[PDB]
Amino acid sequence: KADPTLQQKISQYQVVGRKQPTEAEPNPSLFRMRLFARNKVLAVSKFWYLLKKMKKVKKSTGEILAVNEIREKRPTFVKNFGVWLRYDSRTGTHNMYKEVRDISQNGAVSQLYAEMAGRHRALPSNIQIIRVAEIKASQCRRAHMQQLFDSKLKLPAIRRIFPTPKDKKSVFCARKPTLFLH
RNA sequence: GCUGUCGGUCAUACUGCGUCGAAUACACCGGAUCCCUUCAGACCUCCGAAUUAAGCGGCGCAAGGCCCGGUUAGUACUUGGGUGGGGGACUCCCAGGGAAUACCGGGUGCUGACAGCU
Structure with missing residues:
Protein backbone atom coordinates (compact mmCIF):
# COMPACT_ATOMS: atom_id res chain seq x y z
CA LYS A 1 0.00 0.00 0.00
CA ALA A 2 2.92 2.35 0.77
CA ASP A 3 4.05 3.57 -2.65
CA PRO A 4 7.22 1.81 -3.92
CA THR A 5 7.82 4.25 -6.76
CA LEU A 6 8.95 7.50 -5.10
CA GLN A 7 12.16 6.40 -3.36
CA GLN A 8 15.22 4.31 -4.23
CA LYS A 9 15.61 1.13 -2.11
CA ILE A 10 18.62 2.32 -0.05
CA SER A 11 19.05 1.18 3.55
CA GLN A 12 21.86 2.18 5.94
CA TYR A 13 23.94 -0.64 7.51
CA GLN A 14 26.64 -0.81 10.16
CA VAL A 15 29.37 -3.40 9.48
CA VAL A 16 32.13 -4.79 11.75
CA GLY A 17 34.92 -7.18 10.71
CA ARG A 18 38.27 -7.84 12.34
CA LYS A 19 40.80 -9.44 9.96
CA GLN A 20 41.43 -12.99 11.26
CA PRO A 21 43.38 -14.70 14.09
CA THR A 22 46.92 -16.05 13.57
CA GLU A 23 49.62 -17.69 15.72
CA ALA A 24 51.83 -14.63 15.15
CA GLU A 25 49.04 -12.11 15.83
CA PRO A 26 46.07 -13.24 18.01
CA ASN A 27 43.22 -10.84 18.93
CA PRO A 28 43.26 -8.17 16.17
CA SER A 29 41.98 -4.62 16.44
CA LEU A 30 38.34 -4.70 15.09
CA PHE A 31 36.76 -2.31 12.56
CA ARG A 32 33.50 -0.40 12.12
CA MET A 33 31.82 1.46 9.24
CA ARG A 34 28.39 2.89 8.33
CA LEU A 35 27.42 2.19 4.71
CA PHE A 36 24.48 2.70 2.37
CA ALA A 37 23.33 -0.14 0.12
CA ARG A 38 20.40 -2.08 -1.32
CA ASN A 39 20.78 -5.04 0.98
CA LYS A 40 22.44 -6.85 3.90
CA VAL A 41 24.70 -8.68 1.39
CA LEU A 42 25.69 -5.71 -0.76
CA ALA A 43 26.76 -3.74 2.34
CA VAL A 44 29.37 -6.45 3.08
CA SER A 45 30.60 -6.25 -0.54
CA LYS A 46 31.05 -2.47 -0.16
CA PHE A 47 32.69 -2.92 3.28
CA TRP A 48 35.50 -5.11 1.88
CA TYR A 49 36.06 -2.79 -1.12
CA LEU A 50 36.44 0.27 1.16
CA LEU A 51 38.49 -1.54 3.81
CA LYS A 52 40.88 -2.69 1.04
CA LYS A 53 41.76 1.00 0.44
CA MET A 54 42.49 1.69 4.14
CA LYS A 55 44.28 -1.39 5.44
CA LYS A 56 45.90 -4.61 4.21
CA VAL A 57 42.74 -6.76 4.40
CA LYS A 58 40.64 -8.88 2.01
CA LYS A 59 37.42 -10.94 2.04
CA SER A 60 39.51 -14.16 2.14
CA THR A 61 41.92 -12.87 4.83
CA GLY A 62 39.08 -11.14 6.76
CA GLU A 63 36.11 -12.20 8.90
CA ILE A 64 32.82 -10.33 9.44
CA LEU A 65 31.01 -10.38 12.79
CA ALA A 66 27.80 -8.33 12.55
CA VAL A 67 25.66 -6.50 10.00
CA ASN A 68 23.35 -4.23 12.00
CA GLU A 69 20.65 -2.39 10.09
CA ILE A 70 20.34 1.23 11.22
CA ARG A 71 17.31 3.46 10.62
CA GLU A 72 16.27 7.03 11.48
CA LYS A 73 15.40 7.93 15.04
CA ARG A 74 12.20 9.88 14.24
CA PRO A 75 11.10 9.80 10.55
CA THR A 76 7.93 11.94 11.00
CA PHE A 77 9.47 15.43 10.61
CA VAL A 78 11.70 17.24 8.12
CA LYS A 79 15.43 17.87 8.65
CA ASN A 80 18.49 19.21 6.82
CA PHE A 81 21.37 16.94 5.73
CA GLY A 82 24.92 17.93 4.80
CA VAL A 83 26.16 15.04 2.66
CA TRP A 84 29.89 14.67 2.02
CA LEU A 85 30.87 12.60 -1.04
CA ARG A 86 33.41 11.78 -3.74
CA TYR A 87 32.99 10.65 -7.34
CA ASP A 88 35.02 9.90 -10.48
CA SER A 89 34.73 12.09 -13.58
CA ARG A 90 36.27 11.10 -16.92
CA THR A 91 39.30 13.23 -15.97
CA GLY A 92 39.74 12.44 -12.25
CA THR A 93 38.33 12.35 -8.71
CA HIS A 94 36.58 15.25 -6.94
CA ASN A 95 35.29 15.65 -3.38
CA MET A 96 31.95 17.47 -3.01
CA TYR A 97 29.59 18.76 -0.32
CA LYS A 98 25.89 18.64 -1.26
CA GLU A 99 22.95 19.63 0.96
CA VAL A 100 19.68 17.71 0.70
CA ARG A 101 16.34 17.93 2.51
CA ASP A 102 14.07 14.98 3.35
CA ILE A 103 12.37 13.12 6.22
CA SER A 104 15.06 10.37 6.36
CA GLN A 105 18.76 9.73 5.64
CA ASN A 106 17.59 6.98 3.27
CA GLY A 107 15.39 9.59 1.56
CA ALA A 108 18.34 12.00 1.22
CA VAL A 109 20.73 9.44 -0.33
CA SER A 110 18.02 8.29 -2.78
CA GLN A 111 17.54 11.98 -3.70
CA LEU A 112 21.31 12.50 -4.07
CA TYR A 113 22.09 9.64 -6.51
CA ALA A 114 19.31 11.09 -8.67
CA GLU A 115 20.77 14.63 -8.39
CA MET A 116 24.39 13.53 -8.87
CA ALA A 117 23.73 11.36 -11.94
CA GLY A 118 21.50 14.06 -13.47
CA ARG A 119 24.00 16.92 -13.18
CA HIS A 120 27.48 15.38 -13.33
CA ARG A 121 26.66 12.07 -15.17
CA ALA A 122 28.32 10.25 -12.27
CA LEU A 123 27.65 6.51 -12.50
CA ILE A 129 29.04 8.89 0.10
CA ILE A 130 31.43 9.52 2.98
CA ARG A 131 29.19 10.73 5.84
CA VAL A 132 25.60 12.00 6.18
CA ALA A 133 25.30 14.37 9.16
CA GLU A 134 22.15 16.10 10.42
CA ILE A 135 22.34 19.91 10.16
CA LYS A 136 20.64 22.86 11.89
CA ALA A 137 18.89 25.39 9.68
CA SER A 138 21.43 27.99 10.73
CA GLN A 139 24.21 25.87 9.33
CA CYS A 140 23.40 24.92 5.76
CA ARG A 141 25.60 27.03 3.51
CA ARG A 142 23.72 26.53 0.27
CA ALA A 143 21.38 29.19 -1.11
CA HIS A 144 18.71 26.77 -2.42
CA MET A 145 18.30 25.48 1.18
CA GLN A 146 18.04 28.94 2.74
CA GLN A 147 15.00 30.14 0.78
CA LEU A 148 12.92 27.34 2.33
CA PHE A 149 13.77 28.11 5.95
CA ASP A 150 11.34 30.32 7.91
CA SER A 151 7.91 29.75 9.38
CA LYS A 152 4.84 30.89 7.47
CA LEU A 153 6.43 29.78 4.22
CA LYS A 154 3.86 29.60 1.45
CA LEU A 155 3.91 28.15 -2.05
CA PRO A 156 1.12 28.68 -4.60
CA ALA A 157 0.16 25.74 -6.81
CA ILE A 158 0.81 26.86 -10.41
CA ARG A 159 -0.22 25.05 -13.63
CA ARG A 160 -2.02 21.96 -12.40
CA ILE A 161 -1.20 18.95 -14.56
CA PHE A 162 -2.73 15.97 -12.72
CA PRO A 163 -1.49 12.45 -13.39
CA THR A 164 -4.89 10.80 -13.74
CA PRO A 165 -5.28 7.39 -12.17
CA LYS A 166 -5.51 4.86 -14.97
CA ASP A 167 -9.11 4.07 -15.91
CA LYS A 168 -9.81 7.72 -15.21
CA LYS A 169 -8.02 8.37 -18.50
CA SER A 170 -9.94 8.67 -21.73
CA VAL A 171 -8.52 9.47 -25.16
CA PHE A 172 -11.29 11.97 -26.06
CA CYS A 173 -12.88 14.69 -23.91
CA ALA A 174 -15.36 17.50 -24.60
CA ARG A 175 -14.56 20.62 -22.66
CA LYS A 176 -10.79 21.32 -22.88
CA PRO A 177 -9.06 21.34 -19.44
CA THR A 178 -8.51 24.03 -16.77
CA LEU A 179 -4.97 24.52 -15.43
CA PHE A 180 -5.09 27.69 -13.27
CA LEU A 181 -7.68 25.72 -11.28
CA HIS A 182 -8.39 28.10 -8.32
C1' G B 1 85.29 -23.39 27.71
C1' C B 2 88.96 -24.79 23.94
C1' U B 3 93.34 -27.27 19.82
C1' G B 4 94.05 -30.75 15.76
C1' U B 5 92.68 -34.32 11.28
C1' C B 6 88.55 -35.54 7.76
C1' G B 7 84.16 -33.04 6.69
C1' G B 8 78.57 -30.81 6.23
C1' U B 9 75.74 -25.95 5.15
C1' C B 10 78.89 -22.85 1.62
C1' A B 11 79.45 -14.97 3.32
C1' U B 12 74.72 -14.78 9.78
C1' A B 13 80.71 -18.12 7.48
C1' C B 14 83.47 -12.66 2.90
C1' U B 15 86.80 -8.26 2.99
C1' G B 16 89.22 -4.04 5.59
C1' C B 17 91.40 -2.02 9.95
C1' G B 18 92.50 -2.37 15.39
C1' U B 19 93.28 -4.91 20.39
C1' C B 20 93.60 -9.74 23.18
C1' G B 21 94.75 -15.30 23.25
C1' A B 22 95.60 -20.42 30.01
C1' A B 23 97.02 -25.50 28.13
C1' U B 24 98.10 -29.09 24.71
C1' A B 25 98.25 -28.38 19.33
C1' C B 26 98.61 -26.02 14.43
C1' A B 27 102.63 -22.59 12.97
C1' C B 28 106.59 -19.74 11.99
C1' C B 29 111.35 -21.48 12.32
C1' G B 30 117.12 -24.43 11.85
C1' G B 31 119.81 -27.60 7.99
C1' A B 32 121.08 -29.67 2.66
C1' U B 33 124.23 -35.97 3.53
C1' C B 34 120.89 -39.26 1.10
C1' C B 35 115.26 -39.41 -1.45
C1' C B 36 113.71 -35.39 -4.45
C1' U B 37 113.05 -29.75 -7.27
C1' U B 38 114.39 -25.73 -9.85
C1' C B 39 117.77 -19.83 -12.62
C1' A B 40 117.24 -20.10 -7.21
C1' G B 41 116.73 -25.52 -0.55
C1' A B 42 111.87 -19.17 -1.91
C1' C B 43 108.25 -22.99 -3.47
C1' C B 44 108.67 -28.39 -3.36
C1' U B 45 111.33 -32.67 -0.90
C1' C B 46 113.93 -34.95 2.79
C1' C B 47 116.52 -34.77 8.15
C1' G B 48 115.45 -31.87 12.27
C1' A B 49 113.94 -28.97 17.55
C1' A B 50 118.21 -23.48 19.04
C1' U B 51 108.91 -17.04 19.02
C1' U B 52 103.51 -15.73 19.48
C1' A B 53 105.41 -10.94 15.30
C1' A B 54 102.40 -12.83 11.37
C1' G B 55 99.19 -17.24 9.82
C1' C B 56 95.31 -19.40 13.04
C1' G B 57 91.25 -18.29 17.00
C1' G B 58 88.00 -14.62 20.03
C1' C B 59 86.19 -9.62 20.30
C1' G B 60 85.50 -4.54 18.71
C1' C B 61 84.02 -0.85 14.50
C1' A B 62 77.49 5.08 14.89
C1' A B 63 82.48 0.03 9.12
C1' G B 64 81.28 -1.89 3.73
C1' G B 65 79.10 -6.48 2.33
C1' C B 66 75.92 -10.29 3.38
C1' C B 67 71.24 -12.58 5.89
C1' C B 68 66.38 -11.65 8.29
C1' G B 69 61.93 -8.74 9.18
C1' G B 70 58.85 -4.15 8.83
C1' U B 71 57.57 -0.48 5.59
C1' U B 72 56.86 0.68 0.32
C1' A B 73 51.46 -1.70 -0.67
C1' G B 74 46.36 -4.28 -1.12
C1' U B 75 50.11 0.42 -4.70
C1' A B 76 52.42 -1.61 -9.52
C1' C B 77 50.91 -5.77 -12.39
C1' U B 78 47.25 -9.55 -13.43
C1' U B 79 43.03 -14.10 -14.18
C1' G B 80 37.52 -14.44 -15.25
C1' G B 81 32.78 -11.10 -16.25
C1' G B 82 30.69 -6.26 -18.31
C1' U B 83 24.88 -4.01 -24.67
C1' G B 84 30.59 -0.43 -18.24
C1' G B 85 32.88 4.74 -19.30
C1' G B 86 35.85 7.13 -23.53
C1' G B 87 36.08 10.02 -30.34
C1' G B 88 40.55 7.42 -29.49
C1' A B 89 44.85 6.67 -26.29
C1' C B 90 43.43 4.39 -22.02
C1' U B 91 40.61 3.77 -17.67
C1' C B 92 36.60 2.17 -13.71
C1' C B 93 33.28 -1.54 -11.23
C1' C B 94 32.12 -6.92 -9.95
C1' A B 95 34.41 -12.23 -8.42
C1' G B 96 39.77 -13.53 -7.36
C1' G B 97 45.43 -13.77 -6.94
C1' G B 98 49.18 -10.10 -5.62
C1' A B 99 55.12 -8.24 -6.43
C1' A B 100 60.04 -5.33 -6.42
C1' U B 101 63.82 -1.25 -5.01
C1' A B 102 64.38 3.26 -2.13
C1' C B 103 64.41 4.15 3.44
C1' C B 104 64.95 2.65 9.52
C1' G B 105 64.28 -2.42 13.41
C1' G B 106 67.53 -6.72 14.77
C1' G B 107 71.63 -10.22 13.36
C1' U B 108 77.16 -11.44 11.89
C1' G B 109 76.56 -18.25 12.73
C1' C B 110 75.13 -23.24 13.42
C1' U B 111 77.17 -28.43 13.09
C1' G B 112 78.44 -34.45 12.51
C1' A B 113 82.63 -38.21 13.19
C1' C B 114 87.46 -39.27 15.72
C1' A B 115 91.83 -38.19 18.81
C1' G B 116 93.63 -35.06 22.72
C1' C B 117 93.70 -30.28 26.66
C1' U B 118 91.76 -27.19 33.31
Missing part, protein backbone atom coordinates in the same frame (compact mmCIF):
# COMPACT_ATOMS: atom_id res chain seq x y z
CA PRO A 124 26.43 4.46 -9.49
CA SER A 125 29.82 2.64 -9.40
CA ASN A 126 31.94 5.78 -8.92
CA ILE A 127 30.03 7.55 -6.12
CA GLN A 128 31.00 6.86 -2.50
Whole structure:
Protein backbone atom coordinates (compact mmCIF):
# COMPACT_ATOMS: atom_id res chain seq x y z
CA LYS A 1 0.00 0.00 0.00
CA ALA A 2 2.92 2.35 0.77
CA ASP A 3 4.05 3.57 -2.65
CA PRO A 4 7.22 1.81 -3.92
CA THR A 5 7.82 4.25 -6.76
CA LEU A 6 8.95 7.50 -5.10
CA GLN A 7 12.16 6.40 -3.36
CA GLN A 8 15.22 4.31 -4.23
CA LYS A 9 15.61 1.13 -2.11
CA ILE A 10 18.62 2.32 -0.05
CA SER A 11 19.05 1.18 3.55
CA GLN A 12 21.86 2.18 5.94
CA TYR A 13 23.94 -0.64 7.51
CA GLN A 14 26.64 -0.81 10.16
CA VAL A 15 29.37 -3.40 9.48
CA VAL A 16 32.13 -4.79 11.75
CA GLY A 17 34.92 -7.18 10.71
CA ARG A 18 38.27 -7.84 12.34
CA LYS A 19 40.80 -9.44 9.96
CA GLN A 20 41.43 -12.99 11.26
CA PRO A 21 43.38 -14.70 14.09
CA THR A 22 46.92 -16.05 13.57
CA GLU A 23 49.62 -17.69 15.72
CA ALA A 24 51.83 -14.63 15.15
CA GLU A 25 49.04 -12.11 15.83
CA PRO A 26 46.07 -13.24 18.01
CA ASN A 27 43.22 -10.84 18.93
CA PRO A 28 43.26 -8.17 16.17
CA SER A 29 41.98 -4.62 16.44
CA LEU A 30 38.34 -4.70 15.09
CA PHE A 31 36.76 -2.31 12.56
CA ARG A 32 33.50 -0.40 12.12
CA MET A 33 31.82 1.46 9.24
CA ARG A 34 28.39 2.89 8.33
CA LEU A 35 27.42 2.19 4.71
CA PHE A 36 24.48 2.70 2.37
CA ALA A 37 23.33 -0.14 0.12
CA ARG A 38 20.40 -2.08 -1.32
CA ASN A 39 20.78 -5.04 0.98
CA LYS A 40 22.44 -6.85 3.90
CA VAL A 41 24.70 -8.68 1.39
CA LEU A 42 25.69 -5.71 -0.76
CA ALA A 43 26.76 -3.74 2.34
CA VAL A 44 29.37 -6.45 3.08
CA SER A 45 30.60 -6.25 -0.54
CA LYS A 46 31.05 -2.47 -0.16
CA PHE A 47 32.69 -2.92 3.28
CA TRP A 48 35.50 -5.11 1.88
CA TYR A 49 36.06 -2.79 -1.12
CA LEU A 50 36.44 0.27 1.16
CA LEU A 51 38.49 -1.54 3.81
CA LYS A 52 40.88 -2.69 1.04
CA LYS A 53 41.76 1.00 0.44
CA MET A 54 42.49 1.69 4.14
CA LYS A 55 44.28 -1.39 5.44
CA LYS A 56 45.90 -4.61 4.21
CA VAL A 57 42.74 -6.76 4.40
CA LYS A 58 40.64 -8.88 2.01
CA LYS A 59 37.42 -10.94 2.04
CA SER A 60 39.51 -14.16 2.14
CA THR A 61 41.92 -12.87 4.83
CA GLY A 62 39.08 -11.14 6.76
CA GLU A 63 36.11 -12.20 8.90
CA ILE A 64 32.82 -10.33 9.44
CA LEU A 65 31.01 -10.38 12.79
CA ALA A 66 27.80 -8.33 12.55
CA VAL A 67 25.66 -6.50 10.00
CA ASN A 68 23.35 -4.23 12.00
CA GLU A 69 20.65 -2.39 10.09
CA ILE A 70 20.34 1.23 11.22
CA ARG A 71 17.31 3.46 10.62
CA GLU A 72 16.27 7.03 11.48
CA LYS A 73 15.40 7.93 15.04
CA ARG A 74 12.20 9.88 14.24
CA PRO A 75 11.10 9.80 10.55
CA THR A 76 7.93 11.94 11.00
CA PHE A 77 9.47 15.43 10.61
CA VAL A 78 11.70 17.24 8.12
CA LYS A 79 15.43 17.87 8.65
CA ASN A 80 18.49 19.21 6.82
CA PHE A 81 21.37 16.94 5.73
CA GLY A 82 24.92 17.93 4.80
CA VAL A 83 26.16 15.04 2.66
CA TRP A 84 29.89 14.67 2.02
CA LEU A 85 30.87 12.60 -1.04
CA ARG A 86 33.41 11.78 -3.74
CA TYR A 87 32.99 10.65 -7.34
CA ASP A 88 35.02 9.90 -10.48
CA SER A 89 34.73 12.09 -13.58
CA ARG A 90 36.27 11.10 -16.92
CA THR A 91 39.30 13.23 -15.97
CA GLY A 92 39.74 12.44 -12.25
CA THR A 93 38.33 12.35 -8.71
CA HIS A 94 36.58 15.25 -6.94
CA ASN A 95 35.29 15.65 -3.38
CA MET A 96 31.95 17.47 -3.01
CA TYR A 97 29.59 18.76 -0.32
CA LYS A 98 25.89 18.64 -1.26
CA GLU A 99 22.95 19.63 0.96
CA VAL A 100 19.68 17.71 0.70
CA ARG A 101 16.34 17.93 2.51
CA ASP A 102 14.07 14.98 3.35
CA ILE A 103 12.37 13.12 6.22
CA SER A 104 15.06 10.37 6.36
CA GLN A 105 18.76 9.73 5.64
CA ASN A 106 17.59 6.98 3.27
CA GLY A 107 15.39 9.59 1.56
CA ALA A 108 18.34 12.00 1.22
CA VAL A 109 20.73 9.44 -0.33
CA SER A 110 18.02 8.29 -2.78
CA GLN A 111 17.54 11.98 -3.70
CA LEU A 112 21.31 12.50 -4.07
CA TYR A 113 22.09 9.64 -6.51
CA ALA A 114 19.31 11.09 -8.67
CA GLU A 115 20.77 14.63 -8.39
CA MET A 116 24.39 13.53 -8.87
CA ALA A 117 23.73 11.36 -11.94
CA GLY A 118 21.50 14.06 -13.47
CA ARG A 119 24.00 16.92 -13.18
CA HIS A 120 27.48 15.38 -13.33
CA ARG A 121 26.66 12.07 -15.17
CA ALA A 122 28.32 10.25 -12.27
CA LEU A 123 27.65 6.51 -12.50
CA PRO A 124 26.43 4.46 -9.49
CA SER A 125 29.82 2.64 -9.40
CA ASN A 126 31.94 5.78 -8.92
CA ILE A 127 30.03 7.55 -6.12
CA GLN A 128 31.00 6.86 -2.50
CA ILE A 129 29.04 8.89 0.10
CA ILE A 130 31.43 9.52 2.98
CA ARG A 131 29.19 10.73 5.84
CA VAL A 132 25.60 12.00 6.18
CA ALA A 133 25.30 14.37 9.16
CA GLU A 134 22.15 16.10 10.42
CA ILE A 135 22.34 19.91 10.16
CA LYS A 136 20.64 22.86 11.89
CA ALA A 137 18.89 25.39 9.68
CA SER A 138 21.43 27.99 10.73
CA GLN A 139 24.21 25.87 9.33
CA CYS A 140 23.40 24.92 5.76
CA ARG A 141 25.60 27.03 3.51
CA ARG A 142 23.72 26.53 0.27
CA ALA A 143 21.38 29.19 -1.11
CA HIS A 144 18.71 26.77 -2.42
CA MET A 145 18.30 25.48 1.18
CA GLN A 146 18.04 28.94 2.74
CA GLN A 147 15.00 30.14 0.78
CA LEU A 148 12.92 27.34 2.33
CA PHE A 149 13.77 28.11 5.95
CA ASP A 150 11.34 30.32 7.91
CA SER A 151 7.91 29.75 9.38
CA LYS A 152 4.84 30.89 7.47
CA LEU A 153 6.43 29.78 4.22
CA LYS A 154 3.86 29.60 1.45
CA LEU A 155 3.91 28.15 -2.05
CA PRO A 156 1.12 28.68 -4.60
CA ALA A 157 0.16 25.74 -6.81
CA ILE A 158 0.81 26.86 -10.41
CA ARG A 159 -0.22 25.05 -13.63
CA ARG A 160 -2.02 21.96 -12.40
CA ILE A 161 -1.20 18.95 -14.56
CA PHE A 162 -2.73 15.97 -12.72
CA PRO A 163 -1.49 12.45 -13.39
CA THR A 164 -4.89 10.80 -13.74
CA PRO A 165 -5.28 7.39 -12.17
CA LYS A 166 -5.51 4.86 -14.97
CA ASP A 167 -9.11 4.07 -15.91
CA LYS A 168 -9.81 7.72 -15.21
CA LYS A 169 -8.02 8.37 -18.50
CA SER A 170 -9.94 8.67 -21.73
CA VAL A 171 -8.52 9.47 -25.16
CA PHE A 172 -11.29 11.97 -26.06
CA CYS A 173 -12.88 14.69 -23.91
CA ALA A 174 -15.36 17.50 -24.60
CA ARG A 175 -14.56 20.62 -22.66
CA LYS A 176 -10.79 21.32 -22.88
CA PRO A 177 -9.06 21.34 -19.44
CA THR A 178 -8.51 24.03 -16.77
CA LEU A 179 -4.97 24.52 -15.43
CA PHE A 180 -5.09 27.69 -13.27
CA LEU A 181 -7.68 25.72 -11.28
CA HIS A 182 -8.39 28.10 -8.32
C1' G B 1 85.29 -23.39 27.71
C1' C B 2 88.96 -24.79 23.94
C1' U B 3 93.34 -27.27 19.82
C1' G B 4 94.05 -30.75 15.76
C1' U B 5 92.68 -34.32 11.28
C1' C B 6 88.55 -35.54 7.76
C1' G B 7 84.16 -33.04 6.69
C1' G B 8 78.57 -30.81 6.23
C1' U B 9 75.74 -25.95 5.15
C1' C B 10 78.89 -22.85 1.62
C1' A B 11 79.45 -14.97 3.32
C1' U B 12 74.72 -14.78 9.78
C1' A B 13 80.71 -18.12 7.48
C1' C B 14 83.47 -12.66 2.90
C1' U B 15 86.80 -8.26 2.99
C1' G B 16 89.22 -4.04 5.59
C1' C B 17 91.40 -2.02 9.95
C1' G B 18 92.50 -2.37 15.39
C1' U B 19 93.28 -4.91 20.39
C1' C B 20 93.60 -9.74 23.18
C1' G B 21 94.75 -15.30 23.25
C1' A B 22 95.60 -20.42 30.01
C1' A B 23 97.02 -25.50 28.13
C1' U B 24 98.10 -29.09 24.71
C1' A B 25 98.25 -28.38 19.33
C1' C B 26 98.61 -26.02 14.43
C1' A B 27 102.63 -22.59 12.97
C1' C B 28 106.59 -19.74 11.99
C1' C B 29 111.35 -21.48 12.32
C1' G B 30 117.12 -24.43 11.85
C1' G B 31 119.81 -27.60 7.99
C1' A B 32 121.08 -29.67 2.66
C1' U B 33 124.23 -35.97 3.53
C1' C B 34 120.89 -39.26 1.10
C1' C B 35 115.26 -39.41 -1.45
C1' C B 36 113.71 -35.39 -4.45
C1' U B 37 113.05 -29.75 -7.27
C1' U B 38 114.39 -25.73 -9.85
C1' C B 39 117.77 -19.83 -12.62
C1' A B 40 117.24 -20.10 -7.21
C1' G B 41 116.73 -25.52 -0.55
C1' A B 42 111.87 -19.17 -1.91
C1' C B 43 108.25 -22.99 -3.47
C1' C B 44 108.67 -28.39 -3.36
C1' U B 45 111.33 -32.67 -0.90
C1' C B 46 113.93 -34.95 2.79
C1' C B 47 116.52 -34.77 8.15
C1' G B 48 115.45 -31.87 12.27
C1' A B 49 113.94 -28.97 17.55
C1' A B 50 118.21 -23.48 19.04
C1' U B 51 108.91 -17.04 19.02
C1' U B 52 103.51 -15.73 19.48
C1' A B 53 105.41 -10.94 15.30
C1' A B 54 102.40 -12.83 11.37
C1' G B 55 99.19 -17.24 9.82
C1' C B 56 95.31 -19.40 13.04
C1' G B 57 91.25 -18.29 17.00
C1' G B 58 88.00 -14.62 20.03
C1' C B 59 86.19 -9.62 20.30
C1' G B 60 85.50 -4.54 18.71
C1' C B 61 84.02 -0.85 14.50
C1' A B 62 77.49 5.08 14.89
C1' A B 63 82.48 0.03 9.12
C1' G B 64 81.28 -1.89 3.73
C1' G B 65 79.10 -6.48 2.33
C1' C B 66 75.92 -10.29 3.38
C1' C B 67 71.24 -12.58 5.89
C1' C B 68 66.38 -11.65 8.29
C1' G B 69 61.93 -8.74 9.18
C1' G B 70 58.85 -4.15 8.83
C1' U B 71 57.57 -0.48 5.59
C1' U B 72 56.86 0.68 0.32
C1' A B 73 51.46 -1.70 -0.67
C1' G B 74 46.36 -4.28 -1.12
C1' U B 75 50.11 0.42 -4.70
C1' A B 76 52.42 -1.61 -9.52
C1' C B 77 50.91 -5.77 -12.39
C1' U B 78 47.25 -9.55 -13.43
C1' U B 79 43.03 -14.10 -14.18
C1' G B 80 37.52 -14.44 -15.25
C1' G B 81 32.78 -11.10 -16.25
C1' G B 82 30.69 -6.26 -18.31
C1' U B 83 24.88 -4.01 -24.67
C1' G B 84 30.59 -0.43 -18.24
C1' G B 85 32.88 4.74 -19.30
C1' G B 86 35.85 7.13 -23.53
C1' G B 87 36.08 10.02 -30.34
C1' G B 88 40.55 7.42 -29.49
C1' A B 89 44.85 6.67 -26.29
C1' C B 90 43.43 4.39 -22.02
C1' U B 91 40.61 3.77 -17.67
C1' C B 92 36.60 2.17 -13.71
C1' C B 93 33.28 -1.54 -11.23
C1' C B 94 32.12 -6.92 -9.95
C1' A B 95 34.41 -12.23 -8.42
C1' G B 96 39.77 -13.53 -7.36
C1' G B 97 45.43 -13.77 -6.94
C1' G B 98 49.18 -10.10 -5.62
C1' A B 99 55.12 -8.24 -6.43
C1' A B 100 60.04 -5.33 -6.42
C1' U B 101 63.82 -1.25 -5.01
C1' A B 102 64.38 3.26 -2.13
C1' C B 103 64.41 4.15 3.44
C1' C B 104 64.95 2.65 9.52
C1' G B 105 64.28 -2.42 13.41
C1' G B 106 67.53 -6.72 14.77
C1' G B 107 71.63 -10.22 13.36
C1' U B 108 77.16 -11.44 11.89
C1' G B 109 76.56 -18.25 12.73
C1' C B 110 75.13 -23.24 13.42
C1' U B 111 77.17 -28.43 13.09
C1' G B 112 78.44 -34.45 12.51
C1' A B 113 82.63 -38.21 13.19
C1' C B 114 87.46 -39.27 15.72
C1' A B 115 91.83 -38.19 18.81
C1' G B 116 93.63 -35.06 22.72
C1' C B 117 93.70 -30.28 26.66
C1' U B 118 91.76 -27.19 33.31
